[PDB]
Design a protein around this ligand. Sequence first.
Ligand SMILES: *[C@@H]1O[C@H](CO)[C@@H](O[C@@H]2O[C@H](CO)[C@@H](O)[C@H](O)[C@H]2NC(C)=O)[C@H](O)[C@H]1NC(C)=O
Ligand SMILES: *[C@@H]1O[C@H](CO)[C@@H](O[C@@H]2O[C@H](CO)[C@@H](O)[C@H](O)[C@H]2NC(C)=O)[C@H](O)[C@H]1NC(C)=O
Ligand SMILES: *[C@@H]1O[C@H](CO)[C@@H](O[C@@H]2O[C@H](CO)[C@@H](O)[C@H](O)[C@H]2NC(C)=O)[C@H](O)[C@H]1NC(C)=O
Ligand SMILES: *[C@@H]1O[C@H](CO)[C@@H](O[C@@H]2O[C@H](CO)[C@@H](O)[C@H](O)[C@H]2NC(C)=O)[C@H](O)[C@H]1NC(C)=O
Ligand SMILES: *[C@@H]1O[C@H](CO)[C@@H](O[C@@H]2O[C@H](CO)[C@@H](O)[C@H](O)[C@H]2NC(C)=O)[C@H](O)[C@H]1NC(C)=O
Ligand SMILES: *[C@@H]1O[C@H](CO)[C@@H](O)[C@H](O)[C@H]1NC(C)=O
Lengths: 170, 50, 106
Amino acid sequence: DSTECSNLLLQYGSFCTQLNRALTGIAVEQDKNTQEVFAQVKQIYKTPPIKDFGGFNFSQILPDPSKPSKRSPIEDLLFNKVTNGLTVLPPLLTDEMIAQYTSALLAGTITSGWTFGAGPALQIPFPMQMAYRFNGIGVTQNVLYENQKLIANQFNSAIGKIQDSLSSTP
Amino acid sequence: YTMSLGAENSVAYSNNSIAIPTNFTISVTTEILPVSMTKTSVDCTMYICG
Amino acid sequence: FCGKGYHLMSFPQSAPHGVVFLHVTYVPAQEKNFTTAPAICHDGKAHFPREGVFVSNGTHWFVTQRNFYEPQIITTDNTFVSGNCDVVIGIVNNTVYDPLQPELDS
Ligand SMILES: *[C@@H]1O[C@H](CO)[C@@H](O[C@@H]2O[C@H](CO)[C@@H](O)[C@H](O)[C@H]2NC(C)=O)[C@H](O)[C@H]1NC(C)=O
Ligand SMILES: *[C@@H]1O[C@H](CO)[C@@H](O[C@@H]2O[C@H](CO)[C@@H](O)[C@H](O)[C@H]2NC(C)=O)[C@H](O)[C@H]1NC(C)=O
Ligand SMILES: *[C@@H]1O[C@H](CO)[C@@H](O[C@@H]2O[C@H](CO)[C@@H](O)[C@H](O)[C@H]2NC(C)=O)[C@H](O)[C@H]1NC(C)=O
Ligand SMILES: *[C@@H]1O[C@H](CO)[C@@H](O[C@@H]2O[C@H](CO)[C@@H](O)[C@H](O)[C@H]2NC(C)=O)[C@H](O)[C@H]1NC(C)=O
Ligand SMILES: *[C@@H]1O[C@H](CO)[C@@H](O[C@@H]2O[C@H](CO)[C@@H](O)[C@H](O)[C@H]2NC(C)=O)[C@H](O)[C@H]1NC(C)=O
Ligand SMILES: *[C@@H]1O[C@H](CO)[C@@H](O)[C@H](O)[C@H]1NC(C)=O
């Protein structure tokens, strides 16, 4: 609040304007980064009420209706595990809207595969989508269909191990 | 206002139904990428002292 | 990486201090619902599409390519046999045509 200090500071020119402009550029760049990463879909997709995906369990990654934050158990664990003229500007996208974007992406990739990323979301059963992914890596569809229960059990076990590993590693 | 993230779309998922496209659109989109800047040189002695 | 949609090709254009890419992409449109199955049960054998997907318009079963609707008759030339019908969940019963059958019939 010193007037004499500000009067002497005016002799140095537009240094303060340069620093404020650089900080403003960084601040808008962070919001641009969040838009580029998370806002890649213009449709907010939702999962069906019946979670019949041919044995595949997505409860650890889908949003929990019981929680007010509408986050997944994995996302909730991630948020719990992360802890003089200065101002902190809030982010343009809040955490619930970012979680909503991730939920839309999860619903699109579960119910429609990769179709929603290239155009309109085309529904496909999840085992058939997994068979398409199996064909992408050079494994025939029959291998997926014959061992569907084993693949679903392995996927559920791996997702549970991911949650345990995140909860158990500092 | 509070922003709207996107238009709501509920995909009609069921265990035995698929959606197959019957037509297509040839879409051309623009992507602008900067490559170079203006090449500037400053004579340090002339700038500071003339 | 090269536009929104399935990328077909791209064109470069010079710009002052920059480049403009015209990305020509293929976007699916006018989608239609069909009833689908993982496999076709015929003669105690399970048939799976070689490159397409089994679809049904309500009464008849066909095989089509995944990114465009072009229904074709389910034959031995566009399907492959792996195992019986007891393992695949959701297999349906439909006939599989054989192109060689009229050749030895005549
Ligand atoms: C999907 O996985 C979740 C979590 O692993 C299962 O929820 C469990 O259900 C059992 C039996 O009802 C409970 O004893 C557990 O406490 C539940 N776990 C949690 C974290 O809530 C769920 O049953 C699985 N299957 C489906 C179809 O959702
Ligand atoms: C697929 O969509 C194209 C449009 O891109 C359709 O072409 C149009 O057909 C109508 C009726 O024949 C014409 O009046 C329009 O002028 C056509 N548009 C163009 C750009 O040619 C085409 O008929 C559609 N095909 C199917 C099977 O639905
Ligand atoms: C495929 O079928 C589903 C359900 O039979 C259609 O989804 C319905 O679309 C209408 C019109 O938008 C909605 O009013 C209904 O609520 C939707 N039902 C459900 C369960 O989501 C879907 O539009 C059909 N798709 C095509 C291309 O015909
Ligand atoms: C599903 O598609 C098939 C093939 O296009 C339809 O079968 C044809 O139906 C017409 C209408 O009576 C007949 O004139 C043709 O002879 C049929 N073809 C064959 C090979 O039988 C079938 O009717 C369609 N089903 C529905 C519900 O639309
Ligand atoms: C599909 O066809 C198979 C074989 O033709 C049917 O399986 C038969 O089912 C009857 C009654 O359920 C049994 O008595 C036979 O012994 C079964 N045969 C075999 C080889 O398993 C099957 O039920 C048919 N499915 C539908 C929906 O019609
Ligand atoms: C789809 O689910 C129903 C029960 O809701 C079941 O009767 C049917 O066999 C299932 N079909 C497939 C292909 O899994």
